[PDB]
Symmetry: C2
Subunit: 469 residues, 2 copies
């Protein structure tokens, strides 16, 4: 992927996502040559703009340096802008003509990154399949979450996108997926006989999948209200973590085999009930300093009297022979105390205590971010003159996560993008819960901003079997 | 044990062992208060000497400091010397009178240390049982290796010592034992379900017990010929390591149940054949610098045409349900390339390779000495763009070993002293081997001084299944 020219087409170039997270990421890609050598970037939006205006609105977010200001100039030597609507054929044939008016534009592999409102996918993808399909190079599409709201909406969206493109062409991207420590789980789970045989019912007591970040929903509060944390991160990222924790041994390294194991694992999970769910929402802190004093419901763009939760705790059971009856817990939330994304694996106590009940359940932490590291909280005898053991943390272990994921999109590695059938599995898992939520409008319990989450999630973990030291 | 007075009686005070390793060790114990508060040291030998003579001939080996020069006279205020023969009743009654002529001497707990020539045990222990018995406190003795030469001699010695003292009063000491990594093996084995349930036939590839020394036997060459390396270190130390590795889970942490499991495992071992043994003798180096230029046969005190081995490679298979057919490799020698005392635990390759045959068996090294440490040479993903692991070093981790070994017999904790039944099983297992050697007079393979050892041992590891990376 270093000789065949590639083009990165940002639909919604004037959009805020393209302005803050896409263009800076592609620039960081271009600075160190991680992109293909012949890389073109095409912006697309409604209002008429120019490359100079794009520079004006993007340079502050670039974090540019005079050492590679020349590399920045080379970066904007490859940028172009096309203006048009998204629901008209004239603009799209104009875009096709502009794209073909390049160095082997027809031969160029197009990589479509959609940064558009969710309501517009149904027309954007259709017009793409009508007009912007390459006849020489491959076509890949990146859709941004969420991919629907419930079972029927997701089914219609997935069926439409599948009738348009094959599954090899769809990259349902996941922003928060670290791809470095999640990649470390794979090696640490297959490359060891130490961890292999104990990856079954009789050994792994429970599984904790946690995703926390310290900040809330500043400014863009009206975007969360209709979606919720479940559809935001936990149905995609937390379930990806659950699949990569509970899955069987894949037949090979291949992405399709791993995703088949994912599909089998979710197929071996029964429906989620109301009593296996805890929901919470954050409120302002009277003792807060910055945004902590102002809550989620206090956002003017958030409608008054909204029952949309931002913290969701749901336990899952993967009922098959390898994972029958085992707990899998999911803790996710916004505006929590600490930024963290870890997979904690508490193992069963050894049958028969000999150390006078001083043994603790062994743990295996896989911290995705920040400070990517993996450590096992096992115990050894402390130095001195006795025999009692002590718990100890022992370390077991480059571009950023989003940049690495876009690199994977170039490389065609679909190991960690959710499949259409995988997404259908995930959606029918929560269809009863989502339907009951949308009908009854349950009230999530307020929780303190910058806290560890509502105590009901801890109650869930203790009830299912999790032990707290 | 800091209120009841203790007596440390070194029988063989004039001996080189007492002058070199016993008195410096007890002095190091006393400088730090490791001995009980009211401790007495009673040297006993044949030649008439005095406390001043003991000071004169033992000071250079103490390594004293001007900071604690006062502790020197504190130590020698508690010393005493008694002269007498080893097989006369008058001398032992005089010694008993000397011991009774002390602060609560009859109440005092006496702790002997038989560091005299082994040819005297049969009579010295009998005279001890006749005269040197305290009717108030505990009585213990320390018999020095070797504990006989064959099954019959060992059985006779053990029967006599058993008729004299109960097994609670018999401490068959081992100098080379570590008491730190050996003490850590049990906790690493029992407090973890990471290593607990995989600790059986299906997962462990094999076990390696290596014990190498850098120096030969210069000076004391006439002592190894009659004994052999097997009866020196392999019989006691490496066998104790095998027992600690392979023993079943005890009902508790007490030495009684631990040695019961020792006995069970020993009973579950078949006899050793000549094809399961590799024997070697070291020879001088033409390219050596110091003692390396002279081999064992070049020592004038070694009889000419001596077929005593200094390298022992003997493989045991603990034939029971939990360890049916798994290898246990025991390697020990003198004058090897580097000092090392390690227990290497290699696990099976995972059932079904998926990393394109880049799998290396997980290792759990327990280096007793030097540089006490446990490190698992497991393999984890290398940072970068590629989905491959690398073999990486992961560390898992105070008086010296001999000091706490002596503190063991002070405290009465018999965790690491071999039982009579364990010793009988140990001698039974090696009886056919030693008898065949004594009959046919085999020729050990000459091997390079300061090398890794003869290639026959490595071929033994390869045959039994050990893998070299």
């Amino acid at each position: 992927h270093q000789s065949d020219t590639h083009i990165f087409i940002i639909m919604g170039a004037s959009g805020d996502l393209a302005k803050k997270k896409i263009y800076p990421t592609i620039w960081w890609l271009f600075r160190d040559g991680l992109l293909p050598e012949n890389t073109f970037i095409v912006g697309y939006a409604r209002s008429r703009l120019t490359v100079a205006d794009i520079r004006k609105q993007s340079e502050p977010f670039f974090k540019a340096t005079p050492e590679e200001k020349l590399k920045l100039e080379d970066f904007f030597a490859r940028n172009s802008y096309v203006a048009g609507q998204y629901d008209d054929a004239a603009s799209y044939q104009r875009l096709n003509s502009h794209m073909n008016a390049l160095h082997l534009g027809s031969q160029a592999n197009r990589l479509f990154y959609l940064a558009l409102p969710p309501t517009v996918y149904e027309a954007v993808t259709k017009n793409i399949h009508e007009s912007c399909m390459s006849q020489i190079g491959w076509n890949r599409i990146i859709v941004e979450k969420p991919f629907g709201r419930d079972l029927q909406s997701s089914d219609r969206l997935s069926n439409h996108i599948s009738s348009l493109f094959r599954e090899d062409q769809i990259y349902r991207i996941d922003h928060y997926l670290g791809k470095e420590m999640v990649q470390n789980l794979m090696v640490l789970r297959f490359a060891n006989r130490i961890f292999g045989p104990i990856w079954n019912r009789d050994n792994i007591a429970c599984v904790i999948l946690t995703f926390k970040e310290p900040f809330g929903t500043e400014g863009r509060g009206g975007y969360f209200d209709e979606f919720g944390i479940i559809r935001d991160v936990m149905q995609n990222h937390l379930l990806q973590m659950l699949c990569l924790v509970a899955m069987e041994k894949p037949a090979s390294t291949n992405s399709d085999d791993v995703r088949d194991e994912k599909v089998k694992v979710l197929k071996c999970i029964s429906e989620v009930q109301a009593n296996n769910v805890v929901l919470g929402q954050y409120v302002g802190n009277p003792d807060g300093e910055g945004e902590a004093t102002k809550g989620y419901l206090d956002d003017p763009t958030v409608p008054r009297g909204s029952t949309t939760a931002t913290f969701a705790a749901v336990v899952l059971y993967v009922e098959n022979e390898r994972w029958d009856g085992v707990p899998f817990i999911l803790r996710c939330g916004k505006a929590l105390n600490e930024r963290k994304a870890e997979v904690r694996l508490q193992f069963h106590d050894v049958a028969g205590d000999i150390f006078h009940q001083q043994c603790k359940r062994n743990e295996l932490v896989i911290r995705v971010q920040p400070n990517e590291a993996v450590y096992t909280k096992m115990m050894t005898k402390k130095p001195g003159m006795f025999f009692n053991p002590e718990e100890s943390e022992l370390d077991l272990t480059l571009p950023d996560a989003y940049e690495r994921l876009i690199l994977d999109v170039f490389c065609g590695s679909q190991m960690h993008f959710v499949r259409s059938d995988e997404l259908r599995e995930a959606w029918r898992i929560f269809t009863p819960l989502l339907h009951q939520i949308e009908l009854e409008k349950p009230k999530p319990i307020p929780y303190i901003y910058g806290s560890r989450g509502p105590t009901e999630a801890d109650e869930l973990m203790k009830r299912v079997g999790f032990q707290y030291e």
